[PDB]
C-alpha cells in the first residue's frame, strides 16, 4: 500500500481459507413431443402437477409423459422439458445445471412415421457430439424395440459403434401401465434410469455405481436373459435389466460405451466430472496474482483440504491420506523459465475406487 | 553514455531475460460459394449463429455450409470465410493467423458444371504453390468422388503427382445428414479433418500426430478397405478413414505427399512451422547491435531457455537435455572474417519425436 | 436521465488508483470491477480474446455471475522486456524514489566510506521493499544484488570522479494461465 | 493381447510409452501367474518382459 | 498527502477532537534532519 499522510490504516490480509463446494448432479433434460404447451422453450418442472398444468397428461399416446412419470416415480428432483412438436387432434447449450439429457420419444416416429434408421443414427450421433462438446453431461441410449440376442450384438458393432465414452446404452424395454386406456404397453427405459441415477446420487455418494437398483413402476420385460447371453453381452458396453426369482426386476452391469479400458465404468466418469466442475467453479480467484511461493502454498492448502474432505467419506481407496492422493506445487514443477511466461501447474493425482463385480469364494478343506 | 554536467543519472542495463512465446495454430480459411452475403471479403466467424446471420444456412445445396458445420462440430475455434460467388434462385495473403486453407466446394462445379479435370488440377496446383510461397500453411486435398482401388493409385501418380511436402490428401468421402431436406448425402472430408486437427492441437500439443481420431457426425462411407488395400495405399501419401467393428469411423495413416523421406510425417512439419514462426516473431530486437560476445551469450541463453521449456513437456526425444538439443554460438562458428560483414549464425539442432505406427510383440516360450 | 456510450478513460485510472491504494503498486490491475457501468454493446468469446491477447489489446469482459471486469493487463510494446504494466510502474516508482532521495552524494571526497554508505542505504531500501513480498525470492540473497567496490571502480574511472553502484533486482510477474492435471494413479 | 492393446498406435514413441507398456504387461502376467498357471517359485523365474 | 512530502505542516479540524497540529516536520532536503525533535534534542545535548 501507499503511505503518504499520518493516521491509522486498517487493511485485511488475504491469507486465510477459501473452501470449495460441490455441485448438484440431479438434473435431467428430456426432449420430446407433447400435445399442447410452450414450443421450443426449456421449461422447468419439479412436480407432476406443474407438468399436468403445462403440457397436459396422457392424451396423445406419446412417450414423453410416460418417461416424465417414471422419472418422478424413482425419486427425481428437478427436470427440464423441451417440446419439439405435437398435435391436438432444442437450446440446451444455454443451461448449466443439466447433468444428463434424454430423448424418450424418438422411436415413436420410427414406428409409425417410417423415418428409417439413418435419421435416428444421425440424431443420436448429434446428441453424442453435443455431450462430448459440453464435457459435463452423459447420454442415455436405447435400441430399436424388436430385437433379441445375435441381433443387438450386430446392431452395436456393424451399425452403431458409437463409443465416445460419454454414453450408456440400456437394452431391454419395459412394459408399463397407462391409465388413459388402463392398458399395458411397452416403453423404452429412458426416464427410469435417470431416476435411478438421481436416487443413487441422493441417498449415497456419486461414487456408488448404480448397479443393483429396482426399476420401481414396471410389470414385465417381454424377454428373458440367461447367464450365457449376459456373458456374451457383458464384454461389450451393453447393460441389462434382469428378473430374479425372489428379488424382481433389477438393473445389472453398470457399464458404458468405451473401447479404451481407462473409462470402462460409469462411476469413475461421474466422479471425474463432479471434481472437474467443482475445481473449475471454485478457483477463478487465482488469476492475475503476484505468482510467488505464498500463492503456491495457498493453492496446495486449499486442494489438500478439499481432497481430505472428499477422502474422509470413503470415496478414495487408501488406509492413509498419503496413499489416497498427492498434490505437487513447488519449485521442482515450476522452473524459472515456466514462471517467466506466467504459468501455474499444480499437479494433482488421485486414486479412485471401483465396484466389485465378481465375488469368489473357495470353500477348501484343511487339516 | 555522455557525461558533461554534475548530477545523478539513472540508466537501465539491457542485460536480462526476454522470453519467447508461441503462436496459435487453430485457424482455418474456407473458400467456397454461398447464396447471400459479403462478396470477396474474408469474413471472420467464431460460432454458427454468426454464419447463419451472415451467409445463410442450408438453402442452395452447397458444400460450404456442410464443411463449416462439420468444422464447428469437431471443436473448431475461429474460421475465415471467403465467398467467391453464388445465387439466390481470394485475398488470403493479407492474413497472418491462418494455419490451413481449404476449398470445400470445388467438386460441385465438376459434378454439374462440367468444368473438366484440367481446371481442377490447375486450381489445386495454384493453391499448393500459394501454400509453398507462404511457408506457414498446410493444404488439405480430396479426390474426385467416384473411384475405388487401382484407380486412385493411378490418379495420384499419372495425373496428380503434386508432392511439394505441403499437403495432405484424404481419400474416402463421408455421407452426412442434411436438415434442409432431412436426407443423407455424400460430402468431401474437408472441414472434418481441420476440426480434428484443431481438437488435437487444443487438447494435446501440436507434436501429437492426429492418427487415431473419431469423425463426429460421420454416418457411412459407401466404401470399405481391407488390410491389403490399405497396405497398397500406405506406401504412397494416401491416408484413410476406416470403420472398425466396435470403435466406429476413425482416421488412419497420418501421412503427407512428399517423396523426400525427410518430411514423411505431418507432425514434424507442423512442429517445425510452429518453431520457425515463434523464432521469427520473437527475435527482431537483435538487429543492429554492437555484435560482441555479450550478444552471443544473451542469444544462447534465450534459445536454451526456450528449448528447455519445450523439452520439459515431452515434445523432444531424450532422457537428458544434453541429448535433446544443441545450440552453438561462439568464436568457433563466428570467425573474424564473418563478423567483419556483420553476420550472426547461432547454429541450432533439435531431435524431434515420431509416432509409433507398427507395434510388434513376440510371445516366445523359454525355460 | 438516459444511457449513452462513453470511452473507458477515467474508469481505468480510478481502478489503477484503487489498486495502488488498497495493495502495492506491484499488483497488476487485471481483475477489477468497473463500478458505475451498465452494458457494453459488444460481446467477446474465448477465440476472439485469444486473437487479441497476443497484441497489446486489453479487454472488458462480462462474466455470468461476476459482471463486468477488466481482463488482460498488457501494454503496447513489441520488445518482450516490458510486456506487462506492473513491471513498468514498479520501475518508474523505483527510479523516481532513487532520483529524489540521492542528491546529497554529489561533490563528496569519493573514498571507500562513501561506497560503504551508499551500499548500506541501497541495501536497507531494497530489504524494506522485499519484506513486503514485492520481489521473487525465499532469501534476500536471491532477490537483489548491489555492487560498489574496487572491482567496479578502477583508479582510472575514479580519476574522472565517477561512481557506478551497480544494482540488480528480480521482479515478480502476474500469473495469467492456471493449469491443473487431474491424473489417475495407483 | 490383440483385443486390449489397440490404444498404443499413433503415439509420441518416447520412453514413457515403453514404461507404460512394460507396466501393463507385467501386471497382466503377474495376475496370470498368481493363479498357478505358470511354472516358477518366484515371478522372476516365470516370465520376462 | 500532497503537502506532507514537503516541509509543510498543517492545522487540522477533526470532528470530535477540534483543532489540532499535524505533521511535525521541518524545511530540510537532507533526510538526516527530517524531524524537529531530533534537531531539538541534538541542540540540547550540544549546549549541555
Numbering used by the authors:
A (entry chain A), B (entry chain M): 2 to 90, 249 to 526
C (entry chain H): 341 to 526
D (entry chain G): 438 to 486
E (entry chain B): 390 to 437
Sentences from the paper on this structure:
In general, CIS are composed of a contractile sheath that surrounds an inner tube loaded with effectors, fitted with a baseplate complex. A conformational change in the baseplate complex triggers the contraction of the outer sheath, which leads to the propulsion of the inner tube into the target. Here we provide evidence that CIS from the model organism Streptomyces coelicolor (CISSc) function intracellularly and belong to a new class of CIS that exist as free-floating fully assembled particles in the cytoplasm and mediate cell death in response to stress conditions. Similar to the recently described sheath structures observed in AlgoCIS15 and tCIS19, the CISSc sheath is composed of a single protein, Cis2.
To obtain insights into the structural details of the CISSc contractile sheath-tube module, we performed single-particle cryoEM (helical reconstruction) of purified sheath particles from WT S. coelicolor, which had a homogeneous length for the contracted sheath of ~140 nm. The resulting map reached a resolution of 3.6 Å. Contracted sheath proteins adopt a right-handed helical array with an inner diameter of 115 Å and an outer diameter of 233 Å. Cis2 monomers consist of three domains and are well conserved in S. coelicolor and S. venezuelae, sharing ~65% sequence identity. From the resulting map, it was possible to build de novo domains 1 and 2, which contribute to the sheath wall. The additional domain 3, which is located on the sheath surface, seems to be highly flexible and could not be resolved. The overall contracted structure of Cis2 is similar to sheaths of previously characterized systems.
